[PDB]
Amino acid sequence: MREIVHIQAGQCGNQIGAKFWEVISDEHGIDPSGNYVGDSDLQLERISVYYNEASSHKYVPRAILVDLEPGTMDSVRSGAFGHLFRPDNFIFGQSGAGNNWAKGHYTEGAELVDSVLDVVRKECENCDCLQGFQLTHSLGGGTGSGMGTLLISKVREEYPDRIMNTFSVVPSPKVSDTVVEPYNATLSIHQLVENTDETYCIDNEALYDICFRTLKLATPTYGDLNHLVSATMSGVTTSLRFPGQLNADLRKLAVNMVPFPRLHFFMPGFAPLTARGSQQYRALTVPELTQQMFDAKNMMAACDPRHGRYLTVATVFRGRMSMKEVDEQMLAIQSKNSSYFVEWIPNNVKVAVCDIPPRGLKMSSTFIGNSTAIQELFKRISEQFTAMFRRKAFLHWYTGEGMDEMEFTEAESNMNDLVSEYQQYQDAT
């Protein structure tokens, strides 16, 4: 049974984690005390991908919660699933880095990381065949991008074969809540290219765009944006835990998507997203939801896939499907916008199905696009960074900590080589 220890750096990465295990404990039928109350035994036959056992019929999630500031630990302790986690796993410092990167990586985060890897090694020891690590954090912040990349580069030193996932929340140019967001973002990606095996650049703009346009909610009060990123987080590992007609592991997406070892930056997408009570009854019927899935509106990263041709696309399905109706529909998408895919990867749409849907639907299907229009994301940040780095504003809060000044010109050139690398295949053949 392949195993995935699940770290949660940052505050937002802890805000989406309490709605991540809320999905899975419903998906495996697990009470908030930690027992099993599920009906179908096909759930219980493989829960060891995400769980452990107690000295009873009681299961405990393989989670490592890391945040430099408490209170968010007091939220998940007093939430709906407070008695679910292992209380030894709750690693939390004292101060909380105030949106600083040098603090939280060099100064403050180094005093906490050795308390973390004594719990990573404990969870790596109780696993038979470890599959990989997935950590959910927020770029742009202080402790999701300073502690997070320190935690990755210490883990990938010790486990250079296990897969690495990162559900990073990149900053958006419109919905920005931090003046030093273009500093902490462009510092993380230098230490995120070389160590993570496949990330997931979820933006927070398009999640506000889905809940207005597609989902058509009134007020998206953070119990949805930090929930919708969990529905596509269970959608990737829904083939590890359930029997399918054709299933794909985390190694399978990490070998069908990347054509070069630098190009692991994915824009995920989930469908069906109905209205609350309108489109799920009045209009939408659910075969062939790929035309919803490939839409520019129904993305997570705030980039336009019409502005840049795809490289590889993974569409993990979940419902009780029919493999002709999956694949013949998948060919019609590849023949419709035939200029929107790269030439030298023929028949790039990797598919995978399962047999158990999410509870409350009949069919569902995520989508993990490895586009080259993710260069429009990094072209925004490298615009905002190069504006602020001219005046060298906000540098005494980083150079005051143990971080040099040539580190920024080194880290900006590492990003601008990545955008030079992603543009290398948009126009060539």
Partner: protein, 431 residues
């Protein structure tokens, strides 16, 4: 005697045998508990308790596929010492099937064969079942067919491989892990059937009048072909078509062992009454390009040597009469240097019905195995498809980092293009 084991590998390989061994229990009265409430010994080594054990080795490196078989129905039929199971799935990586992980579990699969090949007085041959679509079906089988050819030299070994479809596709590295496996199956294999996966949809669309077929409406049709190929070893008629005096009616040269299967009839239940399914239409249906099992047109190429394998209530009078219309009075041109025609494999046993409700019962059936040169058009849509990807060196770093030398793709493409030149070489006789 005449026993014949069948190893299975891949997500395709176990899923076929989950439904292929569903069929053989119906063709011998074997219960799902393995307890028959004559001569089945080509597929079942029975025990003294009244049980029956199928002679198959279900392997996969990923545990989530065999555990469907190991927990649902038919969980008491098999033997738990033979359902070999790894831990890592060897995800679409030929080097992870041939060098990294498959190297570890070869010595358990190969050990279980000698615990089954020592219960065989007469061993007809091996029946592998894999897909060329990456992973263990191409990576672990290449480490297995290379392995069996050392220990079992003078022994036939069939191969029911699934070819990657031209337009329909599942993997992204489908063209990478198919040039790498034909260097194995060109030498070590013998009469490697290569059915396609798209072409059985175009049989389950018009010939079979169902819509949206799953992989259970498609693996039943691939189980019926392996039934009537081995219907000579366990029934009666005018056969003499055992797997060594049949495969020398197929190959003209040691490199042209790539026939295509074709089954007929596949007529649905509602259309079963509106057609007299007799031997004239039953034979003429096998040569329709909309009725082959591979996405290729045999009207383009030329047949070398078919092998018509009948079964059911036929008589060799009109078999030899309906052949002569197809032999002479048609435009399906044979190659010049063999005018003898093709074999004929008449057997008495009619085919059965899997109770899933796919195709109603008939009285006649064919599995013609034509060694046509229309398989060369099934590789020019792979030689171009692979070289389009290898020109930009995409996805090579997921193989060269796993224990595979980078020059092997420049060897496998060099080999399989010389095969296509060789396959088109025997297409002409006179200047």
């Amino acid at each position: 005697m005449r026993e014949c084991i069948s190893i299975h590998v891949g997500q395709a390989g176990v899923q076929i045998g989950n439904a292929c061994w569903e069929l053989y229990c119906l063709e011998h009265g074997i219960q799902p508990d393995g307890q028959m409430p004559d001569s089945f010994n080509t597929f079942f080594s029975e025990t003294g308790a009244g049980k029956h054990v199928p002679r198959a080795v279900f392997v996969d490196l990923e545990p989530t596929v065999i555990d469907e078989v190991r927990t649902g129905t038919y969980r008491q039929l098999f033997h738990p010492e033979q359902l070999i199971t790894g831990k890592e799935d060897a995800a679409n990586n030929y080097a992870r099937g041939h060098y990294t992980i498959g190297k570890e579990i070869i010595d358990l699969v190969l050990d279980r064969i000698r615990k089954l090949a020592d219960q065989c007085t007469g061993l007809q041959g091996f029946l592998v079942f894999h897909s060329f679509g990456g992973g263990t079906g191409s990576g672990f089988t290449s480490l297995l067919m290379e392995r069996l050819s050392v220990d079992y030299g003078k022994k036939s070994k069939l191969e029911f491989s699934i070819y990657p479809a031209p337009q329909v596709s599942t993997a992204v590295v489908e063209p990478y892990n198919s040039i790498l496996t034909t260097h194995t199956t060109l030498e070590h294999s013998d009469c490697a059937f290569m059915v396609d996966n798209e072409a059985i949809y175009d049989i389950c669309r018009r010939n079979l009048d169902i819509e949206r077929p799953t992989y259970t409406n498609l693996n039943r049709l691939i189980g019926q072909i392996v039934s009537s190929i081995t219907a000579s070893l366990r029934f009666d008629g005018a056969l003499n078509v055992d797997l060594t005096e049949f495969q020398t009616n197929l190959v003209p040269y040691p490199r042209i062992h790539f026939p295509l299967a074709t089954y007929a009839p596949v007529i649905s239940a509602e259309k079963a009454y509106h057609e007299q399914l007799s031997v004239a239409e039953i034979t003429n249906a096998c040569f329709e390009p909309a009725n082959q099992m591979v996405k290729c047109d045999p009207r383009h190429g030329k047949y070398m040597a078919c092998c018509l394998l009948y079964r059911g209530d036929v008589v060799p009078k009109d078999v030899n009469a309906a052949i002569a219309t197809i032999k002479t009075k048609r435009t399906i041109q044979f190659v010049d240097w063999c005018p003898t025609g093709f074999k004929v494999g008449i057997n008495y046993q009619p085919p059965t019905v899997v109770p899933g409700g796919d195709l109603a019962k008939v009285q006649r059936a064919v599995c013609m195995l034509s060694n046509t040169t229309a398989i060369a058009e099934a590789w020019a849509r792979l030689d171009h498809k692979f070289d389009l990807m290898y020109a930009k060196r995409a996805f090579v770093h997921w193989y060269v980092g796993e224990g595979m030398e980078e020059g092997e793709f420049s060897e496998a493409r060099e080999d399989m293009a010389a095969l296509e030149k060789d396959y088109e070489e025997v297409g002409v006789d006179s200047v």
